[PDB]
Write a protein that binds this ligand. Structure first.
Ligand SMILES: *[C@@H]1O[C@H](CO)[C@@H](O[C@@H]2O[C@H](CO)[C@@H](O[C@@H]3O[C@H](CO[C@H]4O[C@H](CO)[C@@H](O)[C@H](O)[C@@H]4O)[C@@H](O)[C@H](O)[C@@H]3O)[C@H](O)[C@H]2NC(C)=O)[C@H](O)[C@H]1NC(C)=O
Ligand SMILES: *[C@@H]1O[C@H](CO)[C@@H](O[C@@H]2O[C@H](CO)[C@@H](O[C@@H]3O[C@H](CO[C@H]4O[C@H](CO)[C@@H](O)[C@H](O)[C@@H]4O)[C@@H](O)[C@H](O)[C@@H]3O)[C@H](O)[C@H]2NC(C)=O)[C@H](O)[C@H]1NC(C)=O
Ligand SMILES: *[C@@H]1O[C@H](CO)[C@@H](O[C@@H]2O[C@H](CO)[C@@H](O[C@@H]3O[C@H](CO[C@H]4O[C@H](CO)[C@@H](O)[C@H](O)[C@@H]4O)[C@@H](O)[C@H](O)[C@@H]3O)[C@H](O)[C@H]2NC(C)=O)[C@H](O)[C@H]1NC(C)=O
Ligand SMILES: CC(C)COC[C@@H](CN(Cc1ccccc1)c1ccccc1)N1CCCC1
Ligand SMILES: CC(C)COC[C@@H](CN(Cc1ccccc1)c1ccccc1)N1CCCC1
Ligand SMILES: CC(C)COC[C@@H](CN(Cc1ccccc1)c1ccccc1)N1CCCC1
Ligand SMILES: *[C@@H]1O[C@H](CO)[C@@H](O)[C@H](O)[C@H]1NC(C)=O
Ligand SMILES: *[C@@H]1O[C@H](CO)[C@@H](O)[C@H](O)[C@H]1NC(C)=O
Ligand SMILES: *[C@@H]1O[C@H](CO)[C@@H](O)[C@H](O)[C@H]1NC(C)=O
Ligand SMILES: *[C@@H]1O[C@H](CO)[C@@H](O)[C@H](O)[C@H]1NC(C)=O
Ligand SMILES: *[C@@H]1O[C@H](CO)[C@@H](O)[C@H](O)[C@H]1NC(C)=O
Ligand SMILES: *[C@@H]1O[C@H](CO)[C@@H](O)[C@H](O)[C@H]1NC(C)=O
Ligand SMILES: *[C@@H]1O[C@H](CO)[C@@H](O)[C@H](O)[C@H]1NC(C)=O
Ligand SMILES: *[C@@H]1O[C@H](CO)[C@@H](O)[C@H](O)[C@H]1NC(C)=O
Ligand SMILES: *[C@@H]1O[C@H](CO)[C@@H](O)[C@H](O)[C@H]1NC(C)=O
Ligand SMILES: *[C@@H]1O[C@H](CO)[C@@H](O)[C@H](O)[C@H]1NC(C)=O
Ligand SMILES: *[C@@H]1O[C@H](CO)[C@@H](O)[C@H](O)[C@H]1NC(C)=O
Ligand SMILES: *[C@@H]1O[C@H](CO)[C@@H](O)[C@H](O)[C@H]1NC(C)=O
Lengths: 131, 250, 131, 250, 131, 250
């Protein structure tokens, strides 16, 4: 599906915050005893609406809510951390969960370079045929 | 199925669960992201009277928490200390590991009372209360949050921070007849209207201090602004006379 | 292994309950504030013993218990939610955890349609050979 | 290795960890399911005297919880409020997020006392106590459960609800000499026998009310049924004279 | 990278403890009511420094600490159990997260046995050519 | 990226995230392991005076826990019961499900007081406190731990246990001027020095009992060993006169 922003307004710029899971630490700052407190672990960035991505993202988060709320209603887990890992698993199962039939629409195997090896070795058998 | 955002043809799209695109590439879980977007950025009214009407109490529904990795700097956040008239707490304490939203230009801290006819306070429009990288369906006591929603993305292969607390007192919280007062000091208050912006409240607070219009007795002084005075569209784009001491500003 | 029900009795019918993670919600029922309480999130169904599946399932759950209890004894996690995700990962690792040797018993790649492409292009080289 | 159920040749089988079947297809985690099956369906005795003997107290073993997605409607569930003779609780409160089993035709609620010689109550045959989509190795206080076991499945590619509470009092819970009383009201009781079915207890309760055979003093009236009276095989397939006031029904 | 033990000392022997997730239980010992208490679930073993693995492992755990601490600083999960499952997912995504171009350096598909089938069936077409 | 250990060319290596090795095989999650290694095995000083200087208190940093599947038998473990001078606890109770390290030849149990100028006690060198298959960044009260670090491995395809508790009293815990006393009984103590090994303390304790050198009043008897006496390099490779009663051993 396509994303149709149907919101009263859109802030076209995204002033965002996040963490860093392997920031190149200076000296001993990676040690919890010496490192920053909870308030000082964030990095910031600013992103503009190139390709309409910011206004599309605001609509995407809005449209995601019904499915996410229904998922949360049905889980017994108090805090859910596994959504992204499960989507990665489903990504793999969609492609590799069964037998990969080469040249099929659901098998992501490209034999082209090895077509240009098998067809490129016919002139080692049909060329070499002197008698 | 929970939607997943993907970039095709220079545009964001929801990935179709039915159709498989073999040229889409996911070489690492680092390409997958969960992000929180503030209702602010969609143009909703952020004043305390308008914001609080979007929340309500409800029993029988267990609270739920989901994590998100990155968020948006917020202009308006909220922090609630609501009790019943009998003194009992309306909101539960923040669970272990749930801290306030990390980027708030203005924290609207509301203290007061209401009937609180329900075990937990939910968002009436189904949005989430965004905390520090955890999104909850309910409000926790004394914990700063932004209203927002969560999106999930599969990405392609690879001024400081100032915050100001604005304090309010409230009665009848969560009902039709909720009354709000902006707090200048513990004895000086301003009758709150939905049209007052954070910048107007802070400037009105400063003039009251420098014009010496605070309470100089032991009683409560409640100023009122008359409609004549304007106030200063989304965030990204005086004479005092006295008439519990009520009064007027014009 | 096969499943041998060795229980004193078997209830051959399965009157079951479960949830729904993306039920087509009516209006605003997906909103937690408006939706059903904890007691009203369940759907029901009835399944009969076709192919002996119900009596086999009762025996399967019985036989699963020793392994599940030993797994739970050895984990330090207070509540375990990850068993099914880990079985999906092990499903993929069993097939794709190493190099896929085509035509091997442990490589689930079917080249048949592309055998009928390479052998079906010999009569574009051996047919076209006029001189 | 935890067994995984799979359907081959029109029959359920345990998938062999050693042999790889390439024509087996798992295209989504939705095909994987965890399910709870009630011991009821295997023909075990469900009366309170028989059921409670399958549980026992034990120290030194940390409790463990595992989730399951779907379960079976239960005829018999149990809900325990057991204290020691000194008044202290024998069972821990239900942890956050653990609710009672959601489908129970009869909830056998047992209150009383016992030695409770252990920190937690386990199932002596290794089964689980099934709650709302969470299976625990131990019993939680005042929380309705069904006895059951869990299976894991890989599936191929794609009357209302009535519940009746039956109340019991118990002494010597969890021992050789446990005594049980069915509760008609707070002063009228029936000596419990293992042969009494839920339907018999509810009908016996109704006749006692309509025959006026309740206690009409301040003392405790304990009726006893003599062996002559029968009772009404698995679930899916009178004269009153008085002799603490004991008595007889024949 | 290689592992360079740069510690003041190295205990070359590893006297280790661990659990067992499916130990062949004797009788009813798998039942929590009858089985061992928390202190009695461990097995022990002794491993020596063959191939320098023990001293390398001590250095590996030491060097892992900065990255692990930075990961823990950035997570909101109170107890992290998912590191190994996520590494298994990343193992699969590195190999199978895109189209597998046969004979490419990043595609772990070995067609050799099926090269020795296609090239081994040329003498069913070039041999059988009598007229 | 968290390093992953792999065996190549008869040697342990860190797997390179950038380069893909197709002949590496991961056919099961069982090949992946998390393991805890004790700082002991790297040659660090394990005496209580040296060990405690590696830990310190700090506020503002939330504690974090990560699990590990297998560990190393420890010679030295530690168990802390530290209060402030006003009697309040310095360390939090062990969270649900966190038990002591399972293999400790000597458990150094330290009770006493200190300023404890911080919410949690961390490892100053960034190591972890190893508990029962859970590694924490902080110290829990009265819970036995070993100092250690965690590694992650991808493996190729497929004397009993004695423990002795050594008790200490401490003042000024976590500072420059921390004083330690080895506890013979509740009234007899030995001034602790960093050079004393566990075996020396246990033998010194035994001679004090059999030479009858304990306190035989109601007062506190504190022995001191003079430098003359030696003590018995890593773990894997007398006349008493009295001068609060202080005294000397030579
Ligand atoms: C995702 O984005 C959507 C579009 O912005 C959001 O839609 C909102 O949905 C809520 C319901 O949950 C609506 O609230 C209702 O509003 C009606 C009408 O209110 C008054 O306003 C109109 C003019 O706007 C006026 O003509 C009417 O007479 C009313 O006086 C109320 O009657 C209902 O009771 C209810 O309050 C929002 O109006 C609607 N917004 C828009 C712009 O359509 C949706 O909530 C977003 N999802 C999340 C999770 O945030
Ligand atoms: C999975 O299904 C299995 C088959 O239904 C279950 O087997 C049950 O296992 C328990 C042990 O945990 C047995 O209980 C034992 O019973 C013996 C004998 O009890 C009396 O009954 C026989 C006649 O049946 C009689 O001849 C004897 O003299 C006894 O008077 C006791 O001596 C033991 O102490 C212990 O209580 C069950 O008997 C057994 N059931 C069957 C039908 O074999 C197994 O429990 C199931 N697993 C789970 C997790 O539920
Ligand atoms: C992984 O292994 C590394 C190598 O064993 C560990 O390195 C240790 O890192 C800490 C810092 O966190 C160092 O502690 C510092 O030591 C200096 C010097 O202390 C005194 O010692 C030298 C002689 O050794 C002497 O010449 C000096 O004058 C000092 O009197 C202090 O000044 C600092 O304040 C700080 O305490 C260790 O010294 C260092 N050890 C080694 C052997 O290099 C590392 O900690 C390990 N990582 C983990 C997580 O355990
Ligand atoms: C769909 C587009 C928005 C593409 O995301 C574009 C951006 C993602 N981040 C920022 C970010 C960074 C690390 C982890 C998660 C998120 C983002 C932050 C907050 C809300 C929404 C997104 N990238 C990343 C940085 C620069 C590019
Ligand atoms: C082995 C056979 C029983 C095949 O399962 C047959 C059935 C599975 N459900 C029902 C179910 C539904 C959603 C999620 C999980 C389970 C089941 C319910 C309770 C206990 C056991 C199974 N399917 C599904 C419905 C109809 C078919
Ligand atoms: C890199 C080498 C050390 C190879 O690991 C060699 C050993 C792994 N165990 C032991 C072990 C066993 C089960 C699960 C996890 C770990 C180990 C134990 C404690 C610390 C470190 C490792 N195997 C396993 C046994 C015998 C072989
Ligand atoms: C709140 O006020 C509205 C009118 O503004 C009225 O319709 C409604 O009944 C009131 N609610 C209650 C609970 O009285
Ligand atoms: C104002 O009142 C609050 C709440 O009672 C109190 O904490 C604060 O100290 C008071 N401030 C002054 C200046 O009196
Ligand atoms: C109001 O003005 C006074 C005077 O400068 C200042 O001290 C106070 O912080 C202001 N209040 C707010 C909420 O900014
Ligand atoms: C004294 O109080 C009055 C109102 O009661 C106020 O307006 C005035 O500012 C106060 N003090 C001054 C002006 O010094
Ligand atoms: C319980 O009673 C049985 C006989 O029914 C007896 O063998 C057993 O010893 C008794 N238990 C105790 C603890 O006395
Ligand atoms: C019966 O006793 C219970 C428990 O003490 C009590 O809660 C209940 O109110 C009583 N009912 C009557 C009718 O007295
Ligand atoms: C017993 O009978 C009375 C009379 O109808 C009824 O009110 C009561 O609920 C019955 N008890 C049970 C447990 O059904
Ligand atoms: C009065 O009590 C007797 C027993 O004490 C009972 O059998 C009778 O039903 C009661 N009342 C009547 C019959 O009204
Ligand atoms: C602790 O003692 C050292 C000298 O051993 C001194 O440098 C330091 O200032 C002292 N710390 C405090 C807090 O006084
Ligand atoms: C020694 O003191 C401890 C702590 O007060 C106490 O628990 C223990 O019983 C005492 N032992 C003796 C022998 O007095
Ligand atoms: C010290 O010696 C006495 C006498 O044998 C013994 O009872 C006690 O356990 C010893 N203390 C320790 C810590 O071993
Ligand atoms: C009595 O106390 C002294 C020191 O006060 C001690 O050295 C001696 O061992 C004690 N008792 C004996 C020797 O019986």
């Amino acid at each position: 599906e396509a994303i149709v922003n149907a919101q009263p307004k859109c802030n076209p710029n995204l002033h965002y915050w996040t963490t860093q899971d392997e920031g190149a630490a200076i000296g001993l700052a990676w040690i919890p005893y010496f490192g920053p407190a909870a308030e000082g672990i964030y990095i910031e960035g600013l992103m503009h609406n190139q390709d309409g991505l910011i206004c599309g993202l605001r609509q995407l988060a809005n449209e995601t809510t019904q499915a996410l709320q229904l998922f949360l209603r049905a889980t017994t887990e108090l805090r859910t951390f596994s959504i992204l890992n499960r989507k990665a698993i489903d990504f793999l199962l969609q492609r590799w969960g069964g037998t990969c039939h080469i040249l099929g629409p659901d098998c992501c195997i490209e034999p082209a370079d090895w077509t240009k090896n098998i067809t490129d070795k016919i002139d080692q058998i049909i060329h070499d045929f002197v008698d | 199925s929970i939607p997943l955002g993907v970039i095709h043809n220079s545009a964001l799209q929801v990935s179709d669960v039915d159709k498989l695109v073999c040229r889409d590439k996911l070489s690492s879980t680092n390409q997958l992201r969960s992000v929180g977007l503030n209702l602010e950025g969609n143009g909703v009214a952020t004043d305390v009277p308008s914001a609080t009407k979007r929340w309500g109490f409800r029993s029988g529904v267990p609270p739920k928490v989901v994590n998100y990795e990155a968020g948006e700097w917020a202009e308006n956040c909220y922090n609630l200390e609501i009790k019943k008239p009998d003194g009992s707490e309306c909101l539960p304490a923040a669970p272990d590991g749930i801290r306030g939203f990390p980027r708030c230009r203005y924290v609207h801290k509301v203290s007061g009372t209401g009937p609180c006819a329900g075990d937990f306070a939910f968002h009436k429009e189904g949005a989430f209360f965004l905390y520090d990288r955890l999104a909850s369906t309910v409000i926790y006591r004394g914990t700063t949050f932004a209203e927002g929603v969560v999106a999930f993305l599969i990405l392609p292969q690879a001024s400081g921070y100032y915050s100001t607390t604005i304090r309010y007192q409230a009665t009848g919280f969560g009902t039709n007849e909720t009354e709000y007062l902006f707090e200048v000091d513990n004895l000086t208050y301003v009758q709150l209207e939905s049209r007052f912006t954070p910048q107007f409240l802070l400037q009105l607070n400063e003039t009251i201090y420098t014009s010496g219009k605070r309470s100089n007795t032991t009683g409560k002084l409640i100023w009122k602004v008359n409609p004549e005075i304007d106030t200063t569209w989304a965030f990204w784009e005086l004479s005092f006379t006295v008439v519990x001491x009520x009064x007027x500003x014009x």
